[PDB]
Amino acid sequence: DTATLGELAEAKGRYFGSATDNPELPDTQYTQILGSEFSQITVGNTMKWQYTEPSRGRFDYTAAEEIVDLAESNGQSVRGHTLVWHNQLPSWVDDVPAGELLGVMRDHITHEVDHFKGRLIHWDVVNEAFEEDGSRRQSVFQQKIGDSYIAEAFKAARAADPDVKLYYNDYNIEGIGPKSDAVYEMVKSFKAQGIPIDGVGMQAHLIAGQVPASLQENIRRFADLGVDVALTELDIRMTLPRTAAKDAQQATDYGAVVEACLVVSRCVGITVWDYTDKYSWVPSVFPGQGAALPWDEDFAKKPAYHAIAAALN
Numbered sequence: 001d002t003a004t005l006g007e008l009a010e011a012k013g014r015y016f017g018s019a020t021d022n023p024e025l026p027d028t029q030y031t032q033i034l035g036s037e038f039s040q041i042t043v044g045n046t047m048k049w050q051y052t053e054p055s056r057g058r059f060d061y062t063a064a065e066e067i068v069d070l071a072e073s074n075g076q077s078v079r080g081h082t083l084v085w086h087n088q089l090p091s092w093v094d095d096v097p098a099g100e101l102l103g104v105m106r107d108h109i110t111h112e113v114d115h116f117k118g119r120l121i122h123w124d125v126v127n128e129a130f131e132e133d134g135s136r137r138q139s140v141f142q143q144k145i146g147d148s149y150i151a152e153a154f155k156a157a158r159a160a161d162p163d164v165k166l167y168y169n170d171y172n173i174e175g176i177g178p179k180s181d182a183v184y185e186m187v188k189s190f191k192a193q194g195i196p197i198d199g200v201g202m203q204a205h206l207i208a209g210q211v212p213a214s215l216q217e218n219i220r221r222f223a224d225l226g227v228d229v230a231l232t233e234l235d236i237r238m239t240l241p242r243t244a245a246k247d248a249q250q251a252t253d254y255g256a257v258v259e260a261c262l263v264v265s266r267c268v269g270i271t272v273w274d275y276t277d278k279y280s281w282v283p284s285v286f287p288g289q290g291a292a293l294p295w296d297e298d299f300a301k302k303p304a305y306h307a308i309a310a311a312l313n
């Protein structure tokens with residue numbers, strides 16, 4: 001047993017984990033690595049609204065529970081994902097009269113947070129609330145509740161579970177720019193108004209060869225605001241097919257990302273959006289792209305894995 005990524009990360013006060021999904025659990029080879037290589041697990045889909053509250057007022061934590069129990073059995077911490085999001089939302093939510101949505105969102109949050117109280121280290125309370133230019137995404141929540149929905153979601157979560165870290169999660173906020181500035185301002189605003197928020201999750205869905213050079217400065221400025229930071233859905237996709245040069249560039253990128261987190265004391269950990277290309281969500285969403293993870297489809301460790309372990313030391 002050589003030091004696993006999880007072990008290397010823990011030695012430096014951080015976690016290194018992977019997201020997973022119920023359909024993958026039957027794959028014995030996949031689960032054996034998932035349970036021994038990582039120190040943290042993120043529930044990839046079954047904690048989302050379409051699954052936990054398929055019909056109004058009727059909750060279902062069955063699927064999510066399976067993954068949480070599995071993580072506990074391996075002594076792995078767990079991150080909840082995600083409470084409020086414009087995607088993967090059951091159809092009844094749109095039919096809720098505008099004036100009732102705030103109460104519905106608060107209730108959804110209260111039941112889910114309460115059910116898992118004491119079992120999760122973090123909760124991605126609100127996910128992808130901003131557009132690339134920094135303006136608010138015009139989701140059903142933004143449109144019918146207004147700008148305060150985000151703050152209300154965090155207050156509802158904190159009221160249901162006092163100890164769990166509350167995170168705001170979004171993509172394309174790794175580098176300093178319009179989007180991250182908007183998140184930065186919101187966080188600063190929350191701190192001043194006493195709105196509860198403990199961290200910022202940078203999804204980090206990156207492109208090989210295009211890692212934001214201002215990544216670490218960006219992580220640092222958030223840490224200086226008084227919040228923790230985590231890379232929550234890390235993957236670095238490339239245009240297929242793979243080549244030694246592309247794999248090498250990807251390795252360099254993974255190393256740079258890991259190093260960046262290690263230099264900022266409040267960067268608590270890294271989670272890859274699953275760990276093997278075999279189950280990566282990338283191909284299905286980004287036509288012609290893939291090979292974004294440290295393990296390939298046959299579970300062989302890529303140069304990326306070597307770079308990650310070296311960075312973790």
Ligand SMILES: [Zn+2]
Pocket residue numbers: 060062063
């Ligand atoms: Zn069910």
Ligand SMILES: [Zn+2]
Pocket residue numbers: 065069
């Ligand atoms: Zn259980």
Ligand SMILES: [Zn+2]
Pocket residue numbers: 107110111
């Ligand atoms: Zn209720």
Ligand SMILES: [Zn+2]
Pocket residue numbers: 176177178181
């Ligand atoms: Zn700026």
Ligand SMILES: [Zn+2]
Pocket residue numbers: 296297298300
């Ligand atoms: Zn291979």
